[PDB]
């Protein structure tokens with residue numbers, strides 16, 4: 001689990017595997033696509049996957065779930081939120097049980113002890 | 120060291136590296152290119168690198184080392200003999216201290232003990 | 239997985255499920271295209287009307 | 289695995305300029321003294337070393353060359369044969385190899 | 388609206404839900420892909436009608 | 450040894466006479482790939 | 487130049503040739519559409535070692551020196 | 555002034571080619587086709603053209619093989635099957651009768667399900683009799 | 688690269704897989720003003736090499752030359 | 753694991769009119785019943801492998 005608003009982009013990249021995905025920060029530009037009026041505090045936009053969640057609620061309050069919520073600005077927020085929590089759950093588990101897969105871990109490329117050098 | 124006349128070619132090919140050279144048997148065809156008469160027993164032609172050695176001797180007896188030994192049939196025998204013992208010396212060392220490099224060795228891809236499978 | 243499975247490997251799961259549609263009108267168009275090619279072969283090399 | 293992949297252990301800052309990719313700066317980079325300042329600073333060291341650091345030098349150089357040998361038994365042989373019967377621990381203290 | 392998505396379930400029991408929406412009797416005899424054959428096949432049928440436009444100018448039909 | 454220490458575990462000389470029957474394994478330079486067209 | 491020491495390693499282009507280095511006295515030339523021979527027509531097998539970086543060597547010299 | 559009569563002439567010929575390509579091609583090539591080459595030349599044209607198209611189709615298929623290999627977990631530097639390094643190459647079948655009699659391309663429609671699959675229908679005949687059908 | 692120990696499947700630099708390509712300078716003035724090819728004759732030995740000649744001048748004076 | 757599963761050869765029909773030797777020889781062949789032995793892998797045809805003795809004329813590319 002991430003206990004902050006920010007995370008080093010390299011700490012979630014693979015060292016011995018091809019990097020085909022990143023774990024980007026929340027896309028704040030999607031918040032300005034909502035045409036209606038809403039109140040959002042800047043203190044909630046950086047934490048992972050939450051901004052997409054609040055946007056989904058705003059869209060489900062202004063519109064409903066039938067024939068009015070089906071507009072591009074609102075469906076992309078629902079998709080980003082559903083996708084952000086799925087990737088973060090997978091990266092979080094991979095961080096818990098496979099920390100040696102990521103850059104920055106000392107077990108990705110273990111440094112030998114001095115007794116292993118024969119000096 | 121090889122204690123026989125015949126060796127399995129696969130036993131001298133690498134398992135985890137590209138195979139760019141083989142350890143071929145003696146080229147008996149080069150023995151028919153000597154124009155002069157000579158006596159050779161079939162019991163000495165299979166042992167590694169010895170045929171090229173005897174041929175070099177036959178050519179150094181008929182001819183010498185100056186202006187008459189310098190013909191293609193005699194220089195290729197001397198070059199083959201010198202090259203055969205160098206390659207066989209390296210393969211023999213590699214077989215002694217790096218047996219895991221070759222096909223057929225049980226250490227190239229070790230089979231695990233049943234205690235390591237968790238059953 | 240422990241008894242009858244392999245190693246747990248991380249892969250990217252494609253949500254897009256492609257599938258080629260087995261249609262009828264597609265082969266009709268295909269024949270029309272070859273019918274033009276064959277007619278041109280006849281029009282150029284087996285036309286004796288002039 | 290991407291062929292142009294590199295793992296760097298010091299921070300780098302990449303320029304966000306169109307059509308170009310490069311390292312434009314290093315975080316917390318301190319500009320040291322100029323080449324002329326270091327030149328003047330070194331000449332003061334070489335000048336003193338030329339005037340006051342040349343007596344009794346032949347002995348210290350022999351000790352230094354003896355300690356550049358592979359094995360210890362050869363060093364002791366070099367000291368006793370070339371440096372006039374010197375001691376291993378006593379010569380190592382002169383050269384500054386002792387703690 | 389979330390409670391409206393579950394309206395057809397509140398009138399049913401769990402056994403009825405399973406037999407209704409989960410355990411649909413297998414029947415693999417339908418031409419399911421007819422939906423696409425009709426849609427995409429319409430471009431050809433529409434072309435047969437559209438190629439007869441009475442527009443006089445050739446470049447207008449272009 | 451000669452003013453040098455090489456740390457190694459206790460050597461077992463019994464491993465010298467380890468019965469290792471050779472097994473057949475042939476390498477085929479030129480074989481089959483995963484997919485074909 | 488002497489005939490290269492027989493080497494059965496080869497690479498086919500159009501069809502499998504089943505090249506046998508012992509079937510001919512002199513090695514036939516390599517045609518582009520027929521075969522490519524192994525590298526090192528005149529080469530031997532040796533063992534080599536990379537030279538560690540100079541600064542890494544100086545740290546090893548200083549450790550042994552401070553050790554003895 | 556320019557020659558305003560030639561305006562949009564390229565667009566107009568393009569639409570006529572689309573309307574009736576065989577007629578546009580026929581009449582634009584009539585005076586050239588008056589001099590017809592021999593059967594041999596005409597055959598060489600067709601043979602070399604269709605052979606080039608046949609190899610183009612095989613290269614399209616080899617690209618789908620490289621894409622499947624990429625999806626399977628093998629990254630690919632470069633492209634094609636002209637292996638620069640220590641690998642065997644497989645050039646296209648030479649379009650001459652010698653190789654066309656010895657070789658023939660793999661027909662995928664000949665790779666089948668084993669007919670032993672049909673012996674599972676024996677279960678159906680037995681269950682029907684067990685249930686009294 | 689082949690001789691250095693890396694076998695090569697295929698050929699060229701048009702990487703089909705997950706790699707960066709570089710197509711070549713478009714032969715138009717826009718890119719010809721921003722980019723220019725690497726001139727190998729500009730890669731040089733460091734002139735600090737010439738400072739080793741100081742050893743020669745000092746030896747010549749020690750030997751009385 | 754994927755490479756290993758892929759070498760398990762598939763089934764390729766013996767019927768072949770593209771190779772002229774089979775086009776002639778198969779006109780005289782007698783189709784005999786292949787009695788089921790209880791398996792789903794009976795190689796009653798040839799196998800889709802380049803090294804098979806009845807498929808070496810096929811070009812696997």
Ligand SMILES: CCCCCCCCCCCCCCCCCC(=O)OC[C@H](COP(=O)([O-])OCC(O)COP(=O)([O-])OC[C@@H](COC(=O)CCCCCCCCCCCCCCCCC)OC(=O)CCCCCCCCCCCCCCCCC)OC(=O)CCCCCCCCCCCCCCCCC
Nearest residue numbers: 422423424425426427428429430431432433434435436437
């Ligand atoms: C007695 C005299 C008559 C008096 C009555 C007068 C009143 C007449 C009208 C009422 C009766 C109509 C009968 C049919 C019932 C239709 C009811 C209806 O609601 O239809 C609306 C219908 C559907 O609306 P839609 O949802 O928007 O679907 C069209 C979308 O384009 C679709 O786009 P898409 O992407 O969503 O889908 C693609 C689509 C394919 O869509 C397309 O590709 C077409 C796109 C149009 C061309 C693209 C350019 C469009 C440019 C935009 C502007 C166009 C304006 C056109 C305005 C036309 C106004 C009518 O493919 C399909 O989805 C399925 C197609 C397969 C259907 C197969 C045909 C079944 C029809 C029945 C066949 C039997 C009828 C007789 C056969 C025809 C006569 C020989 O609208 C249209 O009809 C569109 C025009 C299509 C041309 C039809 C012309 C037929 C005229 C026949 C007249 C009667 C015969 C005359 C005989 C003369 C002697 C008497």
Ligand SMILES: CCCCCCCCCCCCCCCCCC(=O)OC[C@H](COP(=O)([O-])OCC(O)COP(=O)([O-])OC[C@@H](COC(=O)CCCCCCCCCCCCCCCCC)OC(=O)CCCCCCCCCCCCCCCCC)OC(=O)CCCCCCCCCCCCCCCCC
Nearest residue numbers: 556557558559560561562563564565566567568569571572
């Ligand atoms: C405040 C915000 C503002 C926002 C809006 C900003 C927009 C600014 C608007 C102001 C710009 C226009 C200024 C007025 C121009 C007045 C000049 C004039 O008097 O007419 C000259 C020009 C002269 O033509 P012409 O004398 O009748 O005969 C031409 C010759 O015969 C030659 O014909 P040809 O048969 O002999 O064949 C040669 C021909 C064709 O040769 C070709 O092969 C080129 C084919 C190009 C199209 C196809 C490309 C390939 C890809 C598609 C494949 C399609 C075919 C596939 C076939 C099926 C395949 C199975 O060569 C040409 O390219 C002809 C182009 C016309 C000459 C202009 C000089 C071009 C030189 C540069 C060439 C490269 C550019 C090509 C551009 C495309 C031109 C069509 O007539 C015009 O085209 C006037 C065009 C002005 C239309 C304005 C319409 C309203 C604009 C606003 C609407 C909203 C726009 C919103 C945009 C939003 C942002 C994106």
Ligand SMILES: CCCCCCCCCCCCCCCCCC(=O)OC[C@H](COP(=O)([O-])OCC(O)COP(=O)([O-])OC[C@@H](COC(=O)CCCCCCCCCCCCCCCCC)OC(=O)CCCCCCCCCCCCCCCCC)OC(=O)CCCCCCCCCCCCCCCCC
Nearest residue numbers: 267270271274430431434438448449569572573574575579
């Ligand atoms: C350069 C080297 C590389 C070349 C690469 C290959 C080039 C492309 C190859 C394409 C071949 C496809 C052939 C299709 C069937 C043609 C069969 C036929 O009998 O032809 C007559 C046939 C006309 O017969 P028709 O149906 O009775 O129409 C007459 C009506 O009076 C028409 O009434 P209208 O006069 O009032 O209409 C105005 C007229 C003139 O106006 C124009 O056409 C100009 C603007 C047209 C739009 C631009 C076309 C863009 C491409 C079309 C859309 C994508 C492909 C659609 C599928 C096409 C394939 C069927 O429109 C037409 O000409 C006919 C309509 C054109 C098609 C537009 C609708 C497209 C959608 C089709 C929907 C129905 C099919 C269902 C979907 C199928 C897909 C699953 O021609 C066509 O329909 C189109 C042929 C297009 C050929 C273009 C290139 C030909 C020359 C290639 C040369 C190759 C090099 C070797 C030469 C060696 C020489 C030494």
Ligand SMILES: CCCCCCCCCCCCCCCCCC(=O)OC[C@H](COP(=O)([O-])OCC(O)COP(=O)([O-])OC[C@@H](COC(=O)CCCCCCCCCCCCCCCCC)OC(=O)CCCCCCCCCCCCCCCCC)OC(=O)CCCCCCCCCCCCCCCCC
Nearest residue numbers: 586587588589590591592595598599600602603604605606
């Ligand atoms: C989108 C894809 C893009 C890529 C592909 C692009 C493909 C473009 C091709 C477009 C068409 C080419 C241009 C044709 C112009 C229109 C026809 C014409 O020429 O007017 C008639 C006129 C004379 O013919 P005629 O008036 O009917 O009189 C003949 C008598 O009636 C009766 O005959 P005769 O007794 O007076 O003499 C015997 C006979 C001699 O017999 C022959 O006709 C010789 C042809 C034998 C078959 C050759 C194989 C078929 C080639 C096509 C398949 C390509 C294979 C794959 C290529 C892989 C590598 C790319 O003479 C002829 O009948 C005509 C020969 C004149 C040469 C014909 C033009 C060159 C061959 C076609 C070029 C093919 C290029 C395809 C790929 C290009 C990629 C860049 O020809 C001329 O224009 C004279 C030009 C001078 C030609 C002699 C010197 C040429 C030296 C350059 C040779 C270039 C070879 C290229 C090899 C390609 C790679 C292997």
Ligand SMILES: CCCCCCCCCCCCCCCCCC(=O)OC[C@H](COP(=O)([O-])OCC(O)COP(=O)([O-])OC[C@@H](COC(=O)CCCCCCCCCCCCCCCCC)OC(=O)CCCCCCCCCCCCCCCCC)OC(=O)CCCCCCCCCCCCCCCCC
Nearest residue numbers: 282283284590591592593594595596597598600651655772
């Ligand atoms: C009772 C006595 C016998 C009576 C027999 C009855 C005869 C009836 C004649 C019926 C005529 C049919 C009319 C309709 C066809 C007309 C259309 C046509 O294409 O004619 C060519 C026609 C006329 O061309 P031309 O420039 O006036 O030259 C005319 C002659 O070629 C002359 O050219 P030349 O003056 O320069 O002479 C040089 C000659 C020089 O030739 C020689 O000096 C010696 C030839 C030795 C041949 C050695 C063969 C070795 C074979 C080795 C193969 C081993 C592999 C086997 C595999 C086994 C596997 C285990 O080389 C050639 O001409 C090559 C011509 C190719 C001939 C291929 C057939 C050869 C054998 C035919 C045997 C028929 C029985 C005759 C028995 C007579 C015995 C005395 O070409 C065209 O311009 C029309 C378009 C052609 C487009 C190309 C695609 C056409 C293919 C489809 C055609 C239609 C369907 C199939 C028809 C049959 C085609 C073979």
Ligand SMILES: CCCCCCCC/C=C/CCCCCCCC(=O)OC[C@H](COP(=O)(O)OCCN)OC(=O)CCCCCCC/C=C/CCCCCCCC
Nearest residue numbers: 262414415416417418419420421422423424425428429432
């Ligand atoms: C198109 C050929 C017509 C003439 C052919 C003559 C030769 C006849 C030989 C036929 C041999 C019989 C072989 C078996 C045929 C199988 C047909 C098939 O697979 O599709 C059947 C399937 C039945 O649907 P299911 O319920 O899903 O399947 C249940 C299965 N029991 O039929 C369909 O797909 C529906 C579409 C059938 C074709 C529709 C014709 C399209 C033409 C449209 C224009 C007609 C006018 C429309 C006016 C609209 C007015 C509102």
